[PDB]
Each structure stands twice: as C-alpha cells, then as structure tokens.
Write a protein that binds this ligand. Structure first.
Ligand SMILES: O=C(O)[C@H]1[C@H](c2ccccc2)[C@H](C(=O)Oc2cccc3ccccc23)[C@H]1c1ccccc1
Ligand SMILES: CCCCCCCCCCCCCC(=O)O
Length: 134
C-alpha cells in the first residue's frame, strides 16, 4: 500500500521464468546461467522523492537511484542503456524500461509480507519472491 513497506533488505527465496525473461531480453546463455545461479539481496531505499535499488550478490553489486516519476537512463546488468521511469502506482512500484523500440516492466509489490517481483517483456513473465531480512 505504501513505498515504505518496500524499503529494506530482501533475500531471494524463489524464482520462476527468469531464464525465459533474460532470453527475451537478449541475454547470452552464459550470463543467463550466472544470473540464474545468483541469490542476490535487493536493498530498496526511498527518501520521499529519490528511489535507490541495489542488487547484491557475492562479488557483484549494482545500484541505481532515480527520482520517482522522472525519466532517467539506466545501465542494466546485461548492458542495456534504457530510458527508465519508476512510479509507485496502485500499491506497486513499477519500473518501466524502454530501449531500441523494445520495452520491459518490472513490478514490485508486497504480498503476504513478502516482496513479489514480476518481470515482463512482450508475453514473457517471470516471478521472483524475496523475504524481508532487514
Ligand atoms: O560487466 C560484467 O562483466 C558483468 C556484469 C555486471 C557485474 C556487476 C555489476 C554490474 C554488472 C554482468 C553480471 O555479472 O551481472 C550479474 C550477474 C549475477 C549477479 C549480479 C548481481 C549484481 C549485479 C550484477 C550481477 C557481467 C556481464 C557479462 C557480459 C555482458 C554483460 C555483463
Ligand atoms: C541480477 C540478475 C542477473 C542480471 C543479468 C540479467 C539481466 C536481468 C535484469 C533483470 C533482473 C531484475 C529482477 C529482480 O530484481 O529480481
């Protein structure tokens, strides 16, 4: 219901369709297997205006900060330069990515106290579940 319920550190506990989603993004099989094997924490921070999302695995960290509602450029882990906008809408944090006439949406919402992250591109959907650790 609020963005503050999404703030904190989350640990990945379940994943479904992530390989199909990365494949839809154009990610090579090597990066797909590395991404599938990773069990990253996700740290979400928000000061009212600025949203920061950090993804942390052993030896690998990526993080971006943006202003909610304002377009910005994202450098994704697979190496896309996207135009991205993050909004909080209808109880979910929605991250919309646009690049090369393509687009993808990552939605993060609270469900039964867990963080449910659904990544969509074209007609491929992936769902990843994290538990609160901090
Ligand atoms: O550029 C590289 O060599 C690597 C990229 C990268 C590593 C760390 C920070 C940002 C980007 C990809 C990669 O390792 O993604 C992840 C995989 C698994 C877990 C991750 C957790 C946090 C951040 C990134 C992760 C590597 C890569 C290889 C080839 C083409 C593009 C990217
Ligand atoms: C860290 C996952 C592997 C990174 C390489 C593939 C790029 C996929 C980007 C989408 C990952 C974000 C979804 C999530 O928070 O679980």
């Amino acid at each position: 219901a609020t963005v503050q319920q999404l703030e904190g550190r989350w640990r990945l506990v379940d994943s479904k369709g992530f390989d199909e989603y990365m494949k839809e993004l154009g990610v090579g099989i090597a990066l797909r297997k590395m991404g599938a094997m990773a069990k990253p924490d996700c740290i979400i921070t928000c000061d009212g205006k600025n949203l920061t999302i950090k993804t942390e695995s052993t030896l690998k960290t990526t993080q971006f900060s943006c202003t909610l509602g304002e377009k910005f450029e994202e450098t994704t882990a697979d190496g896309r330069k996207t135009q991205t906008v993050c909004n909080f809408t209808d109880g979910a944090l929605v991250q919309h990515q646009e690049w090369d006439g393509k687009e993808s949406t990552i939605t993060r919402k609270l469900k039964d106290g867990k963080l449910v992250v659904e990544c969509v591109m074209n007609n491929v959907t992936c769902t990843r579940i994290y538990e609160k650790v901090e």
